[PDB]
């Protein structure tokens, strides 16, 4: 109810740049995922759920068909690339090397996970080795943590001292991403929208009109 007793929404006109996130030419490795803050703009969510072809569109805590009717103080868009089978880890309470070591959602998550097959653009003949993921880490990530360190992981008793060797591994590994890989191992571009509400005037809303208020009912 962003003052909807009678229609009253912000007089803003600039559109939110979802295209710069969804239609980006290049995406980031999941270990080094990017985030874009969306603010001070009108967000037409109809251009998302009714356009394009997505493989996964799972919203937690909010229905996607009501986004054009709600307002938020901030909305964040996190984008990355993982395997098709690994998309199931992008959800609250999930486990796995992606959920634990690369991207973790909180249990009280309020947003939408959007994913689509990207094999025709994020995979090359000889194999795309530019997309990486974290294979080893001393503990699980906190919700929305972003670890970009390349410290040599000590798997054995002897200390590594920052040199690769016996039981001392480089923590990152490269996806293969070949166009003939099995569909479950093909690259999927994922984007996660987080809907943040603070004690502050809302800055992102759906396209609505306005009236002029009465001193009555």
């Amino acid at each position: 109810q962003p003052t909807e007793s009678i229609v009253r929404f912000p007089n803003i006109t600039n559109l939110c740049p979802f295209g710069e996130v969804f239609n980006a030419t290049r995406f980031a490795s999941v270990y080094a995922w990017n985030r874009k803050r969306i603010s001070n703009c009108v967000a037409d969510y109809s251009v998302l759920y009714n356009s394009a072809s997505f493989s996964t569109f799972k919203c937690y805590g909010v229905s996607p068909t009501k986004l054009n009717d709600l307002c938020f103080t901030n909305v964040y868009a996190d984008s990355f690339v993982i395997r098709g089978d690994e998309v199931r880890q992008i959800a609250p309470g999930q486990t796995g090397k992606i959920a634990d070591y690369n991207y973790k959602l909180p249990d009280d998550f309020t947003g939408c996970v959007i994913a689509w097959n990207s094999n025709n653009l994020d995979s090359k003949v000889g194999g795309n080795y530019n997309y990486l993921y974290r294979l080893f880490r001393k503990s699980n990530l906190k919700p929305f943590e972003r670890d970009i360190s390349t410290e040599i992981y000590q798997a054995g008793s002897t200390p590594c001292n920052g040199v690769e060797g016996f039981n001392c591994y480089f923590p990152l590994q490269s996806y293969g991403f070949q166009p003939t890989n099995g569909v479950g191992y093909q690259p999927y571009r994922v984007v996660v929208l987080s809907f943040e509400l603070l004690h502050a005037p809302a800055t992102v809303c759906g396209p609505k009109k306005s009236t002029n208020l009465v001193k009555n009912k």
Epitope: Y49, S53, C59, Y60, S63, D85, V183, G184
Partner: antibody
Framework: QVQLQESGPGLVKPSETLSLTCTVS????????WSWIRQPPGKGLEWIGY???????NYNPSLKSRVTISVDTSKNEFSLKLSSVTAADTAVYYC???????????????WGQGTLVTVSS | SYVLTQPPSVSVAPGQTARITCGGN??????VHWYQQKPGQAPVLVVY???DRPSGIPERFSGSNSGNTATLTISRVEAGDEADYYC???????????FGTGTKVTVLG
């Protein structure tokens, strides 16, 4: 457009495994979620599970231990296997799908005619 | 497991607006779809995305979803709408698709 047609036996013994097959025509299997839904006589609809064109599956938690859903892209069909059936498994089994992504926006607008499966001694 | 609760039967006069209620704990944060099933036939999608309708369904079908209550409104009720209606939603926490118990709308008179 896309039409779905189920096929399978109409009678199963009270302890054998049920096998069904949904033959899709008019279109392709690629890049969609193909589901199985059943309805006992005079009762409501119950979703069983789906199969993604990669082969990944998601099942009803009540039927997870007994359901197997496979897909054959080179034959344009997906199948269902339900082990250790019981009298409560007598139902009309439909196959359904849509062009919507998994979750929230997913619905069933492509339906089959439905084949009745009876579990009798 | 998630539960969608519907009344087993409701009845309306020919011409009025029939309403089918679909109850669920905080269902307003979920996307409700509706299906019509006539005897001896498969269910057909009549309402999707809370309130939209497919190209074949007439504009007298409409849907609402607000505060643990989703409502399917059928205006100008005719004899040929007497059928069984089910609401269907996807559960986020269980990753499951649930159907309503079912409602048999009978035209009075």
């Amino acid at each position: 457009q896309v039409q779905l047609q189920e096929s399978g036996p109409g009678l199963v013994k009270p302890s054998e495994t049920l096998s069904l097959t949904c033959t899709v025509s008019g279109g392709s299997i690629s890049s969609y979620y193909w589901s199985w839904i059943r309805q006992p006589p005079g009762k409501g609809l119950e979703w069983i599970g789906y199969v993604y064109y990669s082969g990944s599956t998601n099942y009803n938690p009540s039927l997870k231990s007994r359901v197997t859903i496979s897909v054959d892209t080179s034959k344009n069909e997906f199948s269902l296997k339900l082990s250790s059936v019981t009298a409560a498994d007598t139902a009309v089994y439909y196959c359904a799908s849509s062009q919507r992504p998994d979750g929230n926006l997913y619905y069933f607008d492509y339906w089959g005619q439905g084949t009745l499966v009876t579990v009798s001694s | 497991s998630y539960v969608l609760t519907q009344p087993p039967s409701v009845s309306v006069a020919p011409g009025q607006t029939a309403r089918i209620t679909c109850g669920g704990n905080n269902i307003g944060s979920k996307t409700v779809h509706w299906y019509q099933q006539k005897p001896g036939q498969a269910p057909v999608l009549v309402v999707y995305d809370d309130s939209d309708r497919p190209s074949g369904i007439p504009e007298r079908f409409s849907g609402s979803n607000s505060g643990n209550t989703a409502t399917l409104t059928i205006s100008r009720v005719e004899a040929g709408d007497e059928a069984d209606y089910y609401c269907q939603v996807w559960d986020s926490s269980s990753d499951h698709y649930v159907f309503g118990t079912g409602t048999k709308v009978t035209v009075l008179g």
